[PDB]
Amino acid sequence: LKCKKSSSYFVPDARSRCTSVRRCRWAGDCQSGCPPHFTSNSFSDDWAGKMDRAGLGFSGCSDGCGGAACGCFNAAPSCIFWRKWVENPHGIIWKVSPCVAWVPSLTDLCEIEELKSKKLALAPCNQAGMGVVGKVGEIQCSSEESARTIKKDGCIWNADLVGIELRVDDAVCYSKITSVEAVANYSA
Amino acid sequence: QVQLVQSGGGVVKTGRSQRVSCATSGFTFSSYAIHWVRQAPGKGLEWVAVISYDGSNKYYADSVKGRFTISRDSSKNTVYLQMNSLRTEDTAVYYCARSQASWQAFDYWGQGTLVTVSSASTKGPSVFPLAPSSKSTSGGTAALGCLVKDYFPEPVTVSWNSGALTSGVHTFPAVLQSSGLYSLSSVVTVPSSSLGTQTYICNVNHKPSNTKVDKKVEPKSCDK
Amino acid sequence: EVQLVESGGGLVKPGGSLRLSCAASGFTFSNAWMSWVRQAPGKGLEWVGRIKSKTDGGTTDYAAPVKGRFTISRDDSKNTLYLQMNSLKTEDTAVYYCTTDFISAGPWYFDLWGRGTLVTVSS
Amino acid sequence: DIQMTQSPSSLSASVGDRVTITCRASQGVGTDLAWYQQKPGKAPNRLIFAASNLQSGVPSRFSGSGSGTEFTLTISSLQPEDFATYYCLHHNSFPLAFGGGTKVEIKRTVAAPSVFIFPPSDEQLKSGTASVVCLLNNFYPREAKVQWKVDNALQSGNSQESVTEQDSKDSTYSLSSTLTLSKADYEKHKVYACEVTHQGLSSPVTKSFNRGEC
Amino acid sequence: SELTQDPAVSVALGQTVRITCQGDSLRSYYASWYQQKPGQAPVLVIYGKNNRPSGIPDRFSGSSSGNTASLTITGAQAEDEADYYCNSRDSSGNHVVFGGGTKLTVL
Amino acid sequence: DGIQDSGPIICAGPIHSNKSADIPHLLGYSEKICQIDRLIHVSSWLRNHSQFQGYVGQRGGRSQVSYYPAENSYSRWSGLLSPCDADWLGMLVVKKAKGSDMIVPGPSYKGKVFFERPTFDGYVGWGCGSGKSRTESGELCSSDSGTSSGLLPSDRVLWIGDVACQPMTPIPEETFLELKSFSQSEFPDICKIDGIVFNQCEGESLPQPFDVAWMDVGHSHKIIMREHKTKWVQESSSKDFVCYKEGTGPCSESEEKTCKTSGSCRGDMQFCKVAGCEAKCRCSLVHKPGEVVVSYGGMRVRPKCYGFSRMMATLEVN
Ligand SMILES: *[C@@H]1O[C@H](CO)[C@@H](O[C@@H]2O[C@H](CO)[C@@H](O[C@H]3O[C@H](CO)[C@@H](O)[C@H](O)[C@@H]3O)[C@H](O)[C@H]2NC(C)=O)[C@H](O)[C@H]1NC(C)=O
Ligand SMILES: *[C@@H]1O[C@H](CO)[C@@H](O[C@@H]2O[C@H](CO)[C@@H](O)[C@H](O)[C@H]2NC(C)=O)[C@H](O)[C@H]1NC(C)=O
C-alpha cells in the first residue's frame, strides 16, 4: 500500500506568541480612539522591535483603560494595540502530499514526510488551500523557504489558531495549535 | 467603556420573521467576533449564535439550528440577526456581546430588547377596582387596589392618586393566562378610617392603547 | 533540616528598585551554587542568573534581558543569597524562586526549591 | 448532548458571610469556564474567566477555582450588592452552554402573612367573568402553601399566583392567588375559602366568603 | 538554542503516557525533568541517566534518543495531575535553558 | 540476541549494609558477571588507588552510569562490556593517572568521583577519595556534602566515549607495524598524539581536541582510523551463556562447569540447541549482536576493543 502522491506543501513546527502595547492619547496616534488607518495587516512601532516584519501574524486596535491608575495622565482614554503570530525555532518542517486514492503496492488520507530525519508517516489532511482547525493543514506554506520563518507571503492562516485576552498591560497567548507529531507518532 | 446600540424590538404574530441590529463603535471591527444571548422571562440564560470576523466561521445553537441567521456589515459596522419560522415559545429578551476569537468568553454587552410572540392583537385594558370590606377589617387597617385585566402586549403601570398615594402600595408581576392576555393587580394596605372620607383614584398608564382609563374605588359590605 | 526562605519583595512602581534575599541553614553554604528563576502567573520558568562559589571564583553571568539592569551576590558570613533590581519594568511582575543543588550534584540539576517571593511592578 | 449543573439551587446569607457555589460538569472541560452576573433589570457582567483569572474592573473579593468536572466559585465577603443570579459558562467546544444559575437572597427573621380575600365585584358580573382573589402580604421564607376549598372541594389547574420581588426595605415578599371561573359556576357554589399553611404559621389559617352575604 | 515542550496532554486513568522534550543541545548533555502541582513549588522527578531520587516511585522512567528526551509514566492515577518542565544548558556552556511546560491531567 | 535490553543482565540492583564491608573474591563466570551488574569492580578500583571507602552505584547498578557524549549507541545492549568491566576478568589494565596526562575538554566534570578515558597507548582513570568530588575543570578533588553516606548514586560515575569489547584472537607482530605504516597517511596534518610521535615533525602547535575512531590490538599503542567498515559475526561460544537459579545466588563454579559441559541443566532455545537440555539452573543468552569484525586495508581484523572517543592532538607549526 504505497500512496499516490499528489501536490505538496509544507507544515512547520508552529509555536504561538502574542504581544500587546498600551498607548495613551498623548502618544501621538490616539486622539479620539483607534484611528481608522489601522487594519488587520497593519503593524505598530511601540511593540517589541524583535518582531520580524516579514512574518505572518494578526493585529488589532481597541479602546482600553483610562485613568490615573493606568499610566495615562489627565484621565485620557487610551488606545491599545495587539498582535499574535507564530514561529519555528527548530525548523522541523514536514512536506505534505495528500493521498487522493490508495493503490496496493482510509479516506482523505495523506503522506507527511519528515525532511530532516526522512521519517515517513500517514495521516489524513485537508485539501491544499483551506485552514480547517483540528486537522492537518492548519498552516500551509508553498515552499520550504517560506516556512522556515513563516513570512507573510506564501503561507495561509486561521487567526483563531492562537488566542488572546487582553489585560491592563499584556495579553494571553492561548494556543489551539495541534501538533502533527502527536498525530503521526501514534499512527506511525 | 466600549459601547454598542441595538434596535428592532416589539411584538410579532406567529409564522412571520423579524430582524434585530447591533451597531458598534470603539474598537477595530475587523478583528473581533459577535455573539447573541437570550433570556426567557423568569428563567435562565441560553446561547444563541456566533459569527466570526470574516464570515468564514459561523455557529448556531442546537435548539434553533437551521432557522436563525447572523450577518455583519464590515463597512457600516452593524450586525443583523434574522429569525425565520417563529413560534410562540421564542419569547425572551435579547442581548448582543463581543469576543476576540470564536471560542473565548464574552467581554462587553449591550442594552438588549424585548421580542414578543402571540396570536392575538393589540387591546387596552379595563380596570375593575377591588372594594375593601368589613370582612377584610384587620385591626383597623384594610387593603384596597385595582385589578388591571385583559391587555396584550406589555407594559402596564399604575399610579395611585396621581402619585400622591405612593407609599405602602405594591404592584405585582403579571401572568399570561390561557386565553393569552397579560394581567396584574396592585394593592395598598391603608387604615380603615381613611375608607370613610379619603377616597382614592387609581390611574393606569397604558400608552400603546391610546387610552387612559382612570377609576375611583368604593368600599363594600358582605355581611348580608 | 533543609530550608530555603525568600524575603524582601513587595509592590514597586515602575522605574523603581528593590533587593531580595534567599536565606538557608542546616548544612554547609560555602560550596554549593545558587541561581534565580521567576515565573509570572500563566508563564513558565525563566532563567535570570546564577552565582558560583570560591572554589572556581564565584564568577557572574546573566541573560540579556536581565543583564544591564539587575545583579546577584551572596554573603558567606550571614549565609544568604541576595539579588538587586534597578530600573524595573512592567514586564517583570512575577514570583521568584532561588535554586540550588544538594544531593544530585550537577550545574543544572536543581532539586531544592524555595517557597518563592512576590514582586508586583505597576502603577 | 452535554449538560452542566449547579449546586445549590438557592442560597442565602447575611452581610460578611462566605458563600460557595459549585458548577458540575458531565465531562472535564479543562480550564474553559467563566462566571456571569446579572443584577435585576440589567445586562450581565463578567467576573471570572479561564476558570482562574479575574476580569479587570472587578473587586478582587470574588474568586474561583477548579479543573475537569469540579468547579467552585467562592465569595469570601458577601454584600447585598452582590445579590444576583450567577451563571457558569463553558467554552471548551461548540456548542457552548450556560448553567442553570444560582440565586442569592437576604436572610432575615420570620413574619406571619395576613390572609385577605376579595369577592368579585358587580360590573364584572354584568360583563360575565368570575374572579376570586386571595391576597397574602408580608411573608417569609418564600415557601408558602395556598389552597382553595370551594364548597369544601378542591379545584385544579385554574389558579395563578405571582410573587413580589425582594423588598428593598424589609425583604418581605407578597402574593395573590387568582381564580377564573365562568358565570354559570359562580351561582353553583355557596362557600369559597382560601387557606394558608406556612412554615412560619403555627397552624393553617383560612378565611372564606359566601355568595349569599355579597 | 532553545528547548520546546508540548503545550499540554492528558491520559485516562490506567495506562502509560509519554512526554517528549526536544532540543539540539541534548546531543551531548542530559536534561532534567520537574513536576509542579498548580499551587505549590516544583519537585524534581528525573535526572541523569534514569536516576530517580529517594521519595519518587520507580514507576517513572526517563530516556533519550538523538536530540529528544522522554519522561514516561505508567499506570495513570488521578492524583498525578500537574505541569512538567525540562531543563538543560546551551552550546556556549554558560547558561541554563528551560522549556515551555506540559500540563498533564488524568481523565 | 541483537535486541537492546533495557534491563540488567542477570541480577538486580543491590542494597548494601555498611560502607566498611569487605568485598570477597569469587570464581564463577556468572558469579563475576553478577558483580559487574552491581558496579562492585569500580568499588574495588576506587579502594585500590583512590583510597575511597564504600560501595558505588546504589539502587541503580550499571544501568545508571553516565556517559559523554550522552547520545550513546552501545550502552543499550546489556551484553557489551566496558573497559572497567574487562579489567575485572583479566582482559586489560586501566592504569592510574599521572602528571603528564592531559584531560580532555568538553565533558561535564563537576561533582564526579571516577572517570576513565582511552589514551593513544592505553586507558587512564581519574578518581577521588572519601568525601570529595571534582571541580568544573577537573583538576583537584574538593570536599562535598553529598558524599557523607559513602553509598553514592550511580550518576556519580562517568565513562567517556562509546566503547565496548570482547575476547581477542592474537595477531602476528609484524602485521601491526605494516598497518601503522599505512595509517600514517590518513591524518598527515597531525604530528603528536598524547605526547607520542605519529609523524616525523620538528615543531608542533599547542594541544587541541580531535575526533577519531580507533581499535586496540596490544603492542605499543592502538591503531587510529579515518574510514572503515565493520560487521557483526555470530559465533555463540560457551562464554555467551550465564545463569542464576532463583532464590540465593548464581550457580557454583562446579555446577556452572557441569551445566556448560554435560548438558544436564535447563536451558533456552539456543542453549538447548547447542548442547541439549534435560529446582535447577536455567541458562540463557545475552543481548548483544555477538562478535565484531572490522575491515581495514583489505586485510580485515578481529580487534580487542573498538570504540569512539575524543583525543588530544598537535599540529606542525608552519
Ligand atoms: C584490587 O587489588 C586486589 C588485591 O589486593 C585485587 O584482588 C586480587 O585479585 C587477584 C586476581 O583475581 C587474586 O589473585 C588470585 O586469586 C585466587 C586466590 O583466591 C587465585 O586462584 C587466582 O588464580 C588469582 O591468581 C587475588 O586473590 C585478589 N585478592 C584478594 C584479597 O582476593 C583486585 O582485583 C584489585 N582490583 C582491581 C579492579 O584490579
Ligand atoms: C560493617 O562491616 C564490617 C566489615 O564486614 C563488619 O565487621 C565484621 O564484623 C564481624 C562480626 O561483627 C567480624 O566477624 C568480622 O571480622 C568483621 N570484619 C571487619 C573487616 O571488621 C561489621 O560487623 C559491619 N557492621 C554492621 C553490618 O553493622
The angle formed by the CA atoms of residues D2, D6 and D11, to the nearest 5 degrees, is: 165
Chains D and A touch (3+ CB pairs under 8 A): yes
Ligand 1 pocket mutation pick from F22, F25, F52 by most atoms within 8 angstroms of CB: F25
Angstrom distance (rounded) from CA D127 to CA B150? 13
C-alpha span between A130 and A141 (Å, rounded): 11
Taking chain F, what is the end-to-end CA distance rounded to the nearest angstrom?
52
Determine the Cα–Cα distance for residues F130 and F133; give it in Å rounded to an integer.
9
CB E68 within 8 Å of CB E22? yes
Domain end among B77, B100, B117: B117
Please state, in angstroms and rounded to a whole number, the distance separating the CA atoms of residues A114 and D82. 57
For residues D68 and D148, membership in a common domain is answered with no
Residues B37 and B93 in one domain: yes
Cell numbers 387591546 label which residue? B123
Closest residue by Cα to atom 1, ligand 1, is F48
Whichever domain contains D17, its CATH number is 2.60.40.10
Q: Please check whether residue E45 touches F, CB under 8 A.
A: no
Residues of C in contact with A50 (CB under 8 A): none
What's this structure's resolution in Å?
Answer: 3.3
- Residue B48 lies in domain: 3-117
Burial D139-171 (b: 16+ CB within 10 A, else e): bbeeebebbbebeeeeeeeebbebebebeeeeb
Cell numbers that stand for D137 in this block: 402580604
Q: Cell numbers 387596552 correspond to what residue?
A: B124
Distance from CA of E13 to the nearest CA of A (A): 19
Residue type for position F222: K
Which of E3, E4, E18 is the mutation pick for testing A, counting most A CBs within 10 A?
E4
- Which chains reach chain A with 3 or more Cβ–Cβ distances below 8 angstroms? B, C, D, E
Q: Any idea what the Cα angle at residue C13 is, between residues C8 and C18, rounded to 5°?
A: 30
d(CA D47, CA D30): 18
Q: Which domain holds residue D147?
A: 114-210
Task: Give residue F21 CA to ligand 2 midpoint distance, Å.
Answer: 6
Nearest to D135 by CA among B127, B135, B176: B135
Chain E: give the shortest CA distance to residue D196, in Å: 51
C-alpha cell at F195: 605526547
Residues after which chain F is discontinuous, using a C–N cutoff of 2.5 Å: 278
F26 CA from centroid of ligand 1 (Å)? 9
Cell numbers at A104, concatenated: 496496493
> Left if phi > 0, otherwise alpha if psi is -120 to 50, otherwise beta: which for F205?
beta
Helix/strand/coil percentages in chain B, nearest 5: 5, 45, 50
Closest CA to F18 of F59, F53, F65: F53
Backbone torsions φ then ψ of A144, nearest 5 degrees: -65, -30
Q: Are residues D54 and D86 in the same domain?
A: yes
Dihedral of CA E3/E6/E12/E15: which sign?
negative
Can you tell me the distance from the alpha carbon of D19 to that of D10, in angstroms, rounded to the nearest whole number? 11
Cell numbers at F220, concatenated: 605499543
The region, left, alpha or beta by phi > 0 then psi within -120 to 50, assigned to residue B38 is beta
Q: Experimentally, how was this structure solved? A: cryo-EM
Is E3 contained in some domain?
A: no
Element (H, E) at B196: helix B194-197
How far, in Å, CA of A134 to CA of A117, rounded?
25
Q: At what angle do helices F29-36 and F40-48 cross, to 10 degrees?
A: 80
Q: Is B162 exposed, middle or buried (0-12, 13-18, 19+ CB in 10 A)?
A: exposed
Is B20 in contact with B113 (CB distance < 8 Å)?
A: yes
Q: How many domains does chain E have?
A: 1
Is C in contact with B (3 or more beta carbon pairs below 8 Å)? no
**Same-domain pairing of D127 and D206:** yes
Identity at D52, one-letter amino acid code: S
Candidates F60, F6, F37, F62; CA nearest to E51 is F60
Query: In sequence order, which ranges of chain A are alpha helices (DSSP H)?
Result: 144-147, 180-186
How far apart are the CA of A2 and the centre of ligand 1, in A? 62
Q: Which atom of ligand 1 is nearest to the CA of F48?
A: 1
Ligand 1 contact, F66 CB (< 6 A): no
In a domain, B193, yes or no: yes
Record: contact F156-C103, CB cut-off 8 A: no
Indicate which ligand has the atom closest to the C-alpha of F88: 1
Concatenating the DSSP letter of every residue in chain F gives: --S--SS-SSSPPP--S-TT--------HHHHHHHHTTTHHHHHHHHHTT---S-EEETTGGGG-EEESS--STTS-SS-B-HHHHHTTTS---EEP-TT--PPSSS--TT-SEEEEEETTEEEEEE--TTEE--TTS-S-EE-GGGSSS-EEGGGEEEESEEEE-------HHHHHHHHHHHTTTS-SEEEETTEE-S--S-B---EEEEEEEEE-SSSS-EEESS-EEEEE----GGG-EEB-TTS-BPPHHHHHHHHHT--S-B-HHHHHHT-------EE--SS--EEEEE-SSS-B--SEEEEEEEEEEEB--
B23 in any annotated domain: yes
φ/ψ (deg, to 5) at F156:
-80, 15
* B194 sits in which H/E element: helix B194-197
Flag whether E81 is in a domain.
yes
Residues D161 and D173 sit within 8 Å (Cβ to Cβ):
no
Query: What is the least distance, in Å, from the CA of D168 to any CA of chain A?
Result: 34
Query: Which positions ≥6 away from E106 have C-beta within 8 Å?
Result: E10, E11, E12, E13, E76, E77, E78, E79, E80, E81
Place of cell 541573560: C63
User: Ligand 1: distance of its center to the CA of F25 in Å?
Assistant: 7
Calpha distance D46→F136 (Å, rounded): 55
Please report, for residues B6, C35, D99, E88, E94, the alpha-carbon distance to residue C50 in angstroms, rounded to integers and kept in the order given: 58, 4, 50, 14, 10
Query: Which numbered ligand comes closest to the C-alpha of F85?
Result: 1
D34 with B105: CB under 8 angstroms?
Answer: yes
Chains D and E touch (3+ CB pairs under 8 A): yes
Among D135, D158, D164, D169, most B C-beta atoms within 10 A, so best to mutate, is: D135
What's the gap in Å between the CA of A177 and the closest CA on chain E?
9
Left (φ > 0), alpha (ψ -120 to 50) or beta: where does B26 sit?
A: left
Q: How far is the CA of F47 from the centre of ligand 2 (A)?
A: 17
What b-and-e string marks burial along D112-138, b requiring 16 or more CB atoms within 10 Å of the CB? ebbbbbbbbbeebeeeebbbbbbbbbb
Q: What is the C-alpha to C-alpha distance for residues B126 and B132, in angstroms, rounded to an integer?
A: 19
CA distances from D84 to D38, D102, D106 (A): 6, 8, 11
Distance CA F282, CA F271 (A): 10
- Within 13 Å, how many C-alpha atoms sit on residue E24's CB side? 9
The Cα of E107 is separated from the nearest Cα of chain D by a number of Å equal to: 7
Inter-residue contact F212 to F190 (CB < 8 Å): no
Neighbours of chain E (3+ CB pairs under 8 A): A, C, D, F
User: H helices of D116-209, where?
Assistant: 123-127, 183-186
A33 conformational bin, left if phi > 0, alpha if psi -120 to 50, beta if neither: left
Q: What is the SS3 assignment for B59? A: strand
* Cell (9 digits) for F275: 548442547
Give the Cα separation of A117 and A91 in Å (integer).
Answer: 12
Amino acid identity, position A77: P
Number of domains in chain C: 1
A120 CA to centre of ligand 2 in angstroms = 61
The answer to the question of residue B224 being in a domain is no
Ramachandran angles phi, psi of D60, nearest 5°: -70, -10
Q: Cβ neighbours of residue F307 under 8 Å, at least 6 residues apart?
A: F74, F118, F161, F162, F163, F164, F165, F213, F214
Q: Indicate which ligand has the atom closest to the C-alpha of F19.
A: 2
D75 plus D132 within the same structural domain: no
Taking the CA of F18 as reference, the closest ligand is 2
Cα B84 to Cα B96: distance, rounded to the nearest angstrom: 19
Instruction: From residue F99, give the alpha-carbon distance in Å to each of F102, F126, F133.
Output: 8, 11, 19
Pairing of strands B113-117, B10-12: parallel
Distance between CA atoms of residues B42 and B38, nearest Å:
12
| D163 part of contact set with chain A, CB < 8 Å | no
**Same domain? D140 vs D77:** no
In a domain, E62, yes or no: yes
SS3 percent helix, strand, coil of chain E, rounded to 5, is 5, 45, 50
F44 lines ligand 1 (CB under 6 A): yes
Cβ-based neighbours of C97, under 8 Å, separated by 6 or more: C6, C36, C37, C38, C39, C45, C113, C114, C116, E41, E42
Instruction: Please spell the DSSP secondary structure of C22-76, one letter per residue.
Output: EEEESS--SS--EEEEEE-TT---EEEEEE--TTTT--EEE-TTTTTTEEEEEET
F45 lines ligand 1 (CB under 6 A): yes
Q: C108: domain CATH number? A: 2.60.40.10
Q: How far apart are CA F166 and CA F240, in angstroms?
A: 11
Question: What residues in E contact D28, CB-CB < 8 Å?
Answer: 10, 105, 107
Question: Does B10 map to a domain?
Answer: yes
Cell (9 digits) for C78: 550571614
Q: Is the peptide bond before D8 cis (omega within 30 degrees of 0)?
A: yes
Is A182 strand, coil or helix? helix
The Cα B38–Cα B160 span in angstroms is 34
How far apart CA D208 and CA F46 sit, in angstroms, is 107
Interchain proximity A174–B27, CB inside 8 Å? no
Pair B188, B131 in one domain: yes
Put simply, the answer to whether A69 touches C123 (Cβ < 8 Å) is: yes
User: E96 to chain C: which residues are within 8 Å by CB?
Assistant: 35, 47, 50, 107-108
Would you call B62 and D1 a contact, using CB atoms and an 8 Å cutoff?
Answer: yes
User: Are F64 and E48 in contact, with CB atoms under 8 Å apart?
Assistant: yes
Residue whose C-alpha cell is 544436564 = F264
Closest CA to C69 of C55, C57, C83, C79: C83
Ligand 2 nearest atom to the CA of residue F17, by list position = 27
Question: Under an 8 A CB cutoff, do A176 and B103 touch?
Answer: yes
**From CA A57, how far away is CA F41, in angstroms rounded?**
60
Shortest CA distance from D29: residue in chain E: E107
On whether the CB atoms of residues A156 and A12 are closer than 8 A, the answer is: no
Which three cell numbers, joined as nine digits, stand for B33? 467576533
Separation of alpha carbons A65 and A79, rounded Å: 8
Torsion of CA B209, B214, B218, B219, to 10 degrees: 50
Is residue C36 a contact partner of residue C96, using CB atoms and an 8 Å limit? Answer: yes
Locate the domains of chain F by residue range: 29-165, 242-284
Residue nearest atom 4 of ligand 2, based on CA coordinates = F21
Q: Which of B70, B90, B117 is the endpoint of a domain?
A: B117
In this structure, the strands spanning C10-12 and C117-121 are parallel
Are the beta carbons of B28 and A34 separated by less than 8 Å? yes
User: Helices marked H in D130-170 — which ranges?
Assistant: none
Q: Cell 581484523: give the residue.
A: F301
Q: Where do we find the cell 542453549?
A: F271
Q: Which residues contact E92 (CB under 8 A, 6 or more apart)?
A: none
Neighbours of B1 (CB within 10 A): 7
3-state secondary structure of C6: strand
Lining ligand 2 with CB less than 6 A are F 17-18, 20-22
Among D66, D86, D106, give the residue marking a domain's end.
Answer: D106
Same domain? For B198 and B133 the reply is: yes
- Cross-chain residue pair E6–A90, CB shorter than 8 Å: no
Does residue C123 sit within a domain?
no
Same domain, D19 and D101: yes
- Whether residue B132 contacts residue B144, with contact meaning beta carbons closer than 8 Å, is answered with yes
Phi, psi (5° rounding) for residue A9? -135, -170
Residues pairing with B39 in the sheet? B45, B93
The rounded distance, in Å, linking the Cα atoms of F128 and F199 is: 36
Strands F190-193 and F305-315: antiparallel
Instruction: Report the alpha-carbon distance of residue D207 to residue B96 in Å, rounded.
Output: 50
